[PDB]
Amino acid sequence: EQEAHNKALNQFKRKLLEHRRYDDQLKQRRQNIRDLEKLY
Amino acid sequence: TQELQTRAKLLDNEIRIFRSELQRLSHENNVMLEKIKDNKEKIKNNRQLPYLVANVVEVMD
């Protein structure tokens, strides 16, 4: 938009946001494998 | 504009390693879930009828 480093940054923001769905999925699956260890 | 271009190139390598770690826990959590089913189908056969009925003298622990 303003810059062609501000057009490369609208797509970097998406990646940053995604990094937020890969941090909640790794802390979930380690919290779910300890709950399946008490059930095994 | 030099800090946000090196910041953005830190989320390309950081998200590439976090996808590899999460693919290992997906394959692993399918192997564990079949160990709980395994035990339980055995446990389902003994649980159903018929079974004697008795009372607890003591729990000695």
Side-chain angles (χ1 to χ4, degrees):
Chain A
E1 294 192 279
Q2 291 177 3
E3 297 182 357
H5 174 70
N6 191 45
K7 183 174 181 180
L9 284 171
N10 313 142
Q11 298 302 313
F12 288 153
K13 177 177 61 69
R14 292 177 68 200
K15 290 177 177 177
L16 176 62
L17 291 170
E18 270 286 309
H19 221 37
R20 293 176 183 177
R21 294 171 176 167
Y22 287 99
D23 163 272
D24 291 343
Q25 289 298 312
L26 287 162
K27 282 163 179 301
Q28 180 178 21
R29 297 289 180 181
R30 291 186 179 94
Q31 182 60 49
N32 289 344
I33 199 170
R34 289 192 294 270
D35 290 349
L36 294 174
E37 184 175 1
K38 294 297 183 181
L39 295 175
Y40 173 60
Chain B
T1 61
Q2 299 180 274
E3 182 287 293
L4 292 177
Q5 190 59 53
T6 312
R7 168 185 181 163
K9 295 300 180 181
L10 290 172
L11 296 174
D12 288 339
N13 290 330
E14 280 288 314
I15 203 166
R16 188 181 306 109
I17 293 169
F18 276 22
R19 235 191 290 97
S20 205
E21 293 166 8
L22 192 59
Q23 287 297 309
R24 186 179 66 180
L25 299 171
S26 311
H27 180 71
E28 287 174 347
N29 284 335
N30 297 331
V31 173
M32 178 58 77
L33 288 171
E34 298 298 317
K35 292 181 180 295
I36 294 168
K37 292 177 185 177
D38 182 68
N39 287 343
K40 77 173 184 170
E41 186 63 16
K42 294 186 284 175
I43 292 169
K44 178 179 64 183
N45 292 336
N46 308 336
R47 286 295 184 281
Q48 71 180 13
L49 63 90
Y51 54 90
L52 166 70
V53 172
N55 65 38
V56 180
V57 159
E58 65 178 357
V59 180
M60 292 179 71
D61 292 325

